[PDB]
Design an enzyme around this catalytic site. Structure first.
Site, PDB file in Angstrom:
ATOM      1  N   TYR A  67      57.859  -0.453  -2.440  1.00  0.00           N
ATOM      2  CA  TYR A  67      56.526  -0.623  -1.985  1.00  0.00           C
ATOM      3  C   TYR A  67      55.714  -0.349  -3.310  1.00  0.00           C
ATOM      4  CZ  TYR A  67      52.374  -0.075   0.946  1.00  0.00           C
ATOM      5  OH  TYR A  67      51.116  -0.293   1.428  1.00  0.00           O
TER       6      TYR A  67
ATOM      7  N   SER B 138      54.344  -5.860   2.678  1.00  0.00           N
ATOM      8  CA  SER B 138      53.067  -5.688   2.471  1.00  0.00           C
ATOM      9  C   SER B 138      52.673  -5.457   0.846  1.00  0.00           C
ATOM     10  CB  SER B 138      52.506  -4.609   3.081  1.00  0.00           C
ATOM     11  OG  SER B 138      51.007  -4.645   3.242  1.00  0.00           O
ATOM     12  N   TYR B 139      52.237  -4.495   0.235  1.00  0.00           N
ATOM     13  CA  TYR B 139      51.990  -4.489  -1.299  1.00  0.00           C
ATOM     14  C   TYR B 139      53.622  -4.465  -1.797  1.00  0.00           C
ATOM     15  CZ  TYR B 139      50.025  -2.907  -5.792  1.00  0.00           C
ATOM     16  OH  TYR B 139      49.670  -2.721  -6.699  1.00  0.00           O
TER      17      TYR B 139
ATOM     18  N   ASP C  22      48.933 -12.326  11.794  1.00  0.00           N
ATOM     19  CA  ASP C  22      48.623 -11.414  10.697  1.00  0.00           C
ATOM     20  C   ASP C  22      46.990 -11.333  10.472  1.00  0.00           C
ATOM     21  OD1 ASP C  22      48.753  -9.129   8.847  1.00  0.00           O
ATOM     22  OD2 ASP C  22      50.627  -9.660   8.105  1.00  0.00           O
TER      23      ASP C  22
ATOM     24  N   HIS D  79      51.103  -7.937  11.472  1.00  0.00           N
ATOM     25  CA  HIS D  79      51.443  -7.161  10.111  1.00  0.00           C
ATOM     26  C   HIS D  79      52.864  -6.539  10.192  1.00  0.00           C
ATOM     27  CE1 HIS D  79      51.237  -6.808   5.997  1.00  0.00           C
ATOM     28  NE2 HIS D  79      50.497  -5.555   6.039  1.00  0.00           N
TER      29      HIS D  79
END
Ligand SMILES: *[C@@H]1O[C@H](CO)[C@@H](O)[C@H](O)[C@H]1NC(C)=O
Ligand SMILES: *[C@@H]1O[C@H](CO)[C@@H](O)[C@H](O)[C@H]1NC(C)=O
Ligand SMILES: *[C@@H]1O[C@H](CO)[C@@H](O)[C@H](O)[C@H]1NC(C)=O
Ligand SMILES: *[C@@H]1O[C@H](CO)[C@@H](O)[C@H](O)[C@H]1NC(C)=O
EC number: 3.4.14.5
Lengths: 725, 728
Positions: free
Chosen positions: A506, A589-590, A667, A699
């Site tokens: 992450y 995500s990140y 999203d 998401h």
């Protein structure tokens, strides 16, 4: 003679065959709490262990909510999810004298938020973006606000960015403890640009709909805020009640800014925390009601400023102040001289502050403040950033430090969270590993162990029949500094065989993936069934280890965090049991961003990677989050690093790797746009890759069917990459 | 061994077909661009001179995309700043160079955001459309006269089509028709006010912070259609002191009673115009013939001169009602029409009589009428050797139409079986274009005695390159199923052993009206698959292909997604039992209508196909446009054909995909078959727990034809097929 028990399989994970019990309870007073026993909602006794059935076994009810005076109960149904926290629902109220549904002045359907007052049976709700107050469930709603307008003006609820990023909640209203006043925020999104995306819906829908949401991307117009408070006690102005605005301090009025939180410190004192859009400067306003008039007195000698020197203010936002009962003192977590977050004590009349903890470890949260003790969670014990323990410290002389959880179960239990009753007479301790989660109840007086609420014996017995992986947590030192990692190791691990390696990343700011928590997840399957090692590594600036590590990434996302993932894989690679030709990486995500930046690094360390819902370019993401770390996308500020740190700028280097790119088309958070631009860049440079879109998923890609499909698809990809039939 | 035809050769056009593209400017001369400049050629003798030197220093400061010489050769129009829209739609800037001097035209220029420009058919009048309004210039160096004032983006279209008319009806952006003289300018006006919008996201350059929503009026199956009006202006009536007047010609009342289309407009003489109208229930078309009334300014459409077309078995025409071809006098015309046994042949009409006389007949079809003189009609047909996928030029005497001569059949029987033709003005000469099955060959002839004059292009250069490449072969043949023969082709790998076991890709389209087995020479993806990867690429024409009569074509009437799909499976089965084909390794792919078939085939439960690729499929007919869809499927209502709309979705067959490997590909900016269609396919597969492969191409439209995307999609599909076929 080899082990012949079943492994933990993908179906196991998807069907949730092996259940973790979480003993979820809700305090309703100082000694009694609520717990759902399968089909029933029981009320329990903290002092003893007597339980009674409260509600036993048309409308599927999403939640029940009792008024603090025990006379009414709310139930929400017809629940319709919006964003992460936001919902609509229908509400009906019942009596708690005669279990009878109130027929008359009923809360409208499509209501957006509801809340009891802290005492009595007052109700405030938000519907069509305006605030309503019911003096009693039987009587008529009084309309507090008339300005509400779809997508434009929000009263008593947040817009998108305030919901996701600054409040982490839909609600934008705050009863005084009296029940006297009702404070609320107003958001004006008139000039905020809209993200628009298609929504395809059921096959029966002939033309696609386009969803339109006010969403400020980095360096776009931000919504504006106003703060008002209303007297609900006496408001005989039934058609037009009078709302009193408290302005932000002139410190804030020089540019655009945020309201971060509000806390009622007493019956007529409220604290406002404001933050500049350049989030290195935050002010606390202390406001006092004056009964001679109807005004509030904010700007005075009661202002408390916080500046960040080596980064931003707070972790994900300025810390929350905790007020004394006679609230002219408060405690707040603050980064100290060595760059470690500890508790500072404040006096409301000027001065600076006085620290009451210190050390090379961080307080994570203050959990409870009593007239004699402050309780907090920290990772002090054993010098383990990835651990969490409950502490108490004496109020008057703050030298007196007791750990309430450390030695409870030190083998099984290293990661605690807590839930206090009213007045913190009792608390539930919640141990989240590395053992099977253990849930206990304690009384504060002598903090004696009363009972064990749930020990997951059932799961434990089931797992005896399964070849389960282990988790190793340790650290490596790169140039002077310890950095922690974890490995999920296949069962009967054999350091003389070569295993394939999946880096789970992450790696976002404020973040931590090497920890002491017990999980049953996709990694569990990869380790158990497919014999893959799944590692995670916390580099610069992962969280909870001081600012020198965390702030290393300030104004320069997609550099050092990506760097550290590479050379972590290089070190992992050097140990004999890791196959250097089968190292992979994936993240969400990140984590999708970092995966993609790693794969585009040209490092030659990684064979393949999976990016799920990645950010691709920081100008595409919301202002509050990215501007916190990146500043503003202008020539004068940080435009330049904004432009050199896209995934797209590295597309050429993907020629070397096998890439799988996944994104939900609906999203609202990380917009499909971001993956659309990555794919276009890869196409334009002539790089082959695999992709998958998920129609109408957001998401989380969290629908039961989509959840199963994505992990199935990723498992196929991983297995092919590692040549695992 | 020699080099093979590789994927890169396809993508980089290594081995180029040479063409010979000419433009007849008169009865005996044509223009031709050689390398850089424009030549003019004498047809009788083949000598040439320079018409326009290689010097675009007249503009010089803009790079020219395209250009257009005025009919009288006085002027050249050049376009720059070319900005693509839909299939044929685009916008541009334009300058006019006056060839009889040296200077460009600088005052009263064509505006910079122009949507369409055309010369008149003679002289050098100009009509153009700008901001949805029509303008006429009588001379390039005179001011424009505004003809329409109602133009409005996305709403009112003067002189240009809206989406559905551009794609499905006219097959063009233009909606204006000069008269032959041309004194009159005829134009259509489209009103899309109540037509629902398709909305999709366009992501554009990386620098665009917020995606923009594209909104296009697009009638889906059974929705509100655009209405049309039709007008004609007397252009000779525009003066310094005389306004533009636009005379309306109304549709006949048989059309006005409900929804209807304008299908086409043909000038018959300098004072007479034909219009074909079509009812929205496309079972009924009416052609009006209208005469100019000198002293009124009116156009008179006499009722006595109406002609109506009806079908029973199916719809009217192939994709549209056929074009009328009028004799010089304008009192008669020839049209291709379906006869008693369902074959399309040439019917002769007098404009004031309802009954038409057929002048050709047989178990084959006339494809097009190409030229009409006072003594002969020239046409293309697939009569020769009974091969529906061949094309030859014939001529027929107008008096004794029983006298027929085939003009191309025996010219070069092995190399040349697929011809098209370009006649000169008044048809004194014609260029023959041979497109297969050998290398393209271009010839010039005199009509006098069908004398061959010279070879223009024989592609000798390409042949010699190709002698050093392992080229595949093409086999064209038929099978018979029941009472009927059905044609197919195979691309065969070089060194083809009829005992060895080859993997098979079924290349499919198989939409109504269509043909995928023919005589054409192609260098394409299949060429690479055969030559490099040793894969057989077959296609099959089942129900209801053309060009083989209404019995075959109309068989899928109101039943899209049935017999078409059945016949592809059966075809693969009969290919299966060949000793040179591996039934464990049969694949199928197709694009658009072909993607739908591919998908309906794979979701069938046939057991035949290991894997399959669908590119921009239709998935559900309610999603596609009114004109195309309703032609074959009628309307999605209980009283009509909704039952079968619902029975013919890809989504309904989701669970059957368990058994196959499926790759689904779609461009996100597809305005034609909307991304929505594949988005619903993917959701239905997800909801049933079926794994598959996918690829979107952001900002790509229906053809996925951007340089880089074209390259990407084909290498991606090649990887998929090879891994399916255990090749690499
Ligand atoms: C034991 O707990 C139950 C749960 O509500 C409660 O009703 C009961 O009063 C308690 N027993 C006593 C004697 O307090
Ligand atoms: C919201 O802001 C807009 C634009 O500045 C302004 O016109 C409007 O008055 C504001 N609305 C309210 C209710 O404050
Ligand atoms: C071609 O030669 C003929 C015969 O001499 C001559 O009349 C004609 O002008 C020439 N045409 C061109 C365009 O060169
Ligand atoms: C287009 O049609 C609408 C009816 O929906 C009508 O109001 C409008 O006047 C029409 N425009 C023209 C130019 O006729």
């Amino acid at each position: 003679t080899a082990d012949s028990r079943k492994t933990y399989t993908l179906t196991d994970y998807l069907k949730n065959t092996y259940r973790l019990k979480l003993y979820s309870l809700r305090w309703i007073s100082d000694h009694e709490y609520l717990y759902k026993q399968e089909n029933n909602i029981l009320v329990f006794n903290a002092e003893y262990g007597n339980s009674s059935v409260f509600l036993e076994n048309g409308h599927s009810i999403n939640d029940y909510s009792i008024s603090p005076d025990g006379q009414f109960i709310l139930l929400e149904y017809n629940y319709v999810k919006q964003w992460r926290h936001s919902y609509t629902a229908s509400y009906d109220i019942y009596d708690l004298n005669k279990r009878q549904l109130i027929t008359e002045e009923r809360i409208p359907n499509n209501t957006q938020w509801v809340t009891w007052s802290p005492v009595g049976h007052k109700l405030a709700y938000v519907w069509n973006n305006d605030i309503y107050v019911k003096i009693e469930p039987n009587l008529p709603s009084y309309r507090i606000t008339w300005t509400g307008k779809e997508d434009i003006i929000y009263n008593g609820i947040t817009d998108w960015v305030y919901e996701e990023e600054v409040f982490s909640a839909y609600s934008a209203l705050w009863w005084s403890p009296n029940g006297t006043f009702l404070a609320y925020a107003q958001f004006n999104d008139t000039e905020v640009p809209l993200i628009e995306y298609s929504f395809y819906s059921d096959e029966s829908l002939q033309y696609p709909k386009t969803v339109r949401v006010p969403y400020p991307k980095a360096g776009a117009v931000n919504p504006t805020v106003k703060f008002f408070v209303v007297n609900t006690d006496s408001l005989s102005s039934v058609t037009n009640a009078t709302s009193i605005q408290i302005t932000a301090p002139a410190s804030m009025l020089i540019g655009d800014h945020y309201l971060c939180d509000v806390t009622w410190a007493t019956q007529e004192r409220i604290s406002l925390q404001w933050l500049r859009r350049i989030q290195n400067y935050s002010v606390m306003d202390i406001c006092d009601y004056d009964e001679s008039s109807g005004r509030w007195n904010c700007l005075v000698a009661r202002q408390h400023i916080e500046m960040s020197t080596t980064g931003w203010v707070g972790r994900f936002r300025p810390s929350e102040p905790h007020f004394t009962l006679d609230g002219n003192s408060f405690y707040k977590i603050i980064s100290n001289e060595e760059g470690y977050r500890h508790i500072c004590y404040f006096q409301i009349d000027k001065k600076d502050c006085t620290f009451i903890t210190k050390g090379t470890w961080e307080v994570i949260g203050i959990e409870a403040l009593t007239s004699d003790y402050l309780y907090y969670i920290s990772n002090e014990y054993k010098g383990m950033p990835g651990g969490r323990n409950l502490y108490k410290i004496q109020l008057s002389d703050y030298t007196k430090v007791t750990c309430l959880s450390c030695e409870l179960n030190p083998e099984r239990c290293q990661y605690y969270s807590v839930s206090f009753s009213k007045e913190a007479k009792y608390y539930q301790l919640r141990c989240s590993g590395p053992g099977l989660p253990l849930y206990t109840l304690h009384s504060s007086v002598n903090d004696k162990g009363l009972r064990v609420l749930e020990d997951n014996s059932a799961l434990d017995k089931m797992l005896q029949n399964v070849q389960m992986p282990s988790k190793k947590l340790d650290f490596i030192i790169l140039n002077e500094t310890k950095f922690w990692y974890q490995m999920i190791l296949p069962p009967h691990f054999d350091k003389s065989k070569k295993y394939p390696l999946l880096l789970d990343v992450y790696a976002g700011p404020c973040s931590q993936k090497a920890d002491t928590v017990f999980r049953l997840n996709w990694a569990t399957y990869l380790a158990s069934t497919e014999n893959i090692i799944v590692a995670s590594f916390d580099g610069r600036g992962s969280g909870y280890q001081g600012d020198k590590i965390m702030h290393a990434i300030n104004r320069r996302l997609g550099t050092f965090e990506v760097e550290d993932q590479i050379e972590a894989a290089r070190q992992f690679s050097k140990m004999g049991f890791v196959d250097n030709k089968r190292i992979a990486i994936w993240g969400w995500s990140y984590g999708g961003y970092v995966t993609s930046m790693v794969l585009g690094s040209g490092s030659g360390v990684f064979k393949c990677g999976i990016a799920v819902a990645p950010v691709s370019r920081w100008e595409y993401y919301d202002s509050v989050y990215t501007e916190r770390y990146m500043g503003l996308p202008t020539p004068e500020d940080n435009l330049d690093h904004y432009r050199n740190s896209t995934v797209m700028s590295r597309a050429e280097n993907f020629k070397q790797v096998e890439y799988l790119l996944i994104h939900g088309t609906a999203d609202d958070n990380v917009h499909f746009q971001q993956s659309a631009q990555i794919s276009k860049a890869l196409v334009d440079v002539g790089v082959d890759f695999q992709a998958m879109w998920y129609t109408d998923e957001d998401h989380g890609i969290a629908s039961s069917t989509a959840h199963q499909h994505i992990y199935t698809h990723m498992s196929h990809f991983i297995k092919q990459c590692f040549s695992l039939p």
